[PDB]
């Protein structure tokens, strides 16, 4: 520790190095698709959409 | 419709109701039991379903 600096830990812990694994998600799939009537068409909200 | 139109189809009584039916193309959606006191003291009035 200093003051000026602050912690600077050694985090390296090498008795175990191999420690997590985390997890493959969502990805949100990103469908490409286009505007037509009656499938993709717009609303008629009186406001702006997300 | 109503959720796009949401400032001119809705009135703000029972009685703007009748008056806008009487004047313009409009079918306003009433309790049954004000319409058989409408329908019944105003007869080019009708209730339309069930
Ligand atoms: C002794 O000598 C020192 C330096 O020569 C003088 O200054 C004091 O010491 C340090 C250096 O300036 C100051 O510590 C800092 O305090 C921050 C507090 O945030 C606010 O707190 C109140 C509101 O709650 C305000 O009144 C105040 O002005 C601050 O804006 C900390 O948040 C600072 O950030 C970092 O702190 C540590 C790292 O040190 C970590 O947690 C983070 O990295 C964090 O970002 C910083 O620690 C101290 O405030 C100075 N003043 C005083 C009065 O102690 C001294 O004046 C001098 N004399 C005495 C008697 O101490
Ligand atoms: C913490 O110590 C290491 C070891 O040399 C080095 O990265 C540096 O001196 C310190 N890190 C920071 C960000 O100051
Ligand atoms: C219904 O309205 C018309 C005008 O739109 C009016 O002439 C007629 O008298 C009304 N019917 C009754 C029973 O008053």
């Known amino acids: 520790w200093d003051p000026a600096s602050g912690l600077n830990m050694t985090e390296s812990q090498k008795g175990k190095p191999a420690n997590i694994t985390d997890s493959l998600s969502n990805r949100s799939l990103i469908v490409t698709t286009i505007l037509e009537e009656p499938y993709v068409l717009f609303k008629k909200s009186d406001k702006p959409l997300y | ?50």
């Open chain 2, 1 to 50: 419709f109503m959720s796009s139109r949401r400032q001119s189809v809705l009135v703000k009584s029972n009685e703007e109701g009748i008056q806008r039916v009487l004047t313009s193309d409009y079918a306003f959606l009433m309790e049954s039991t004000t319409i058989e006191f409408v329908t019944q003291r105003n007869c080019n009035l009708t209730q339309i379903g069930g």
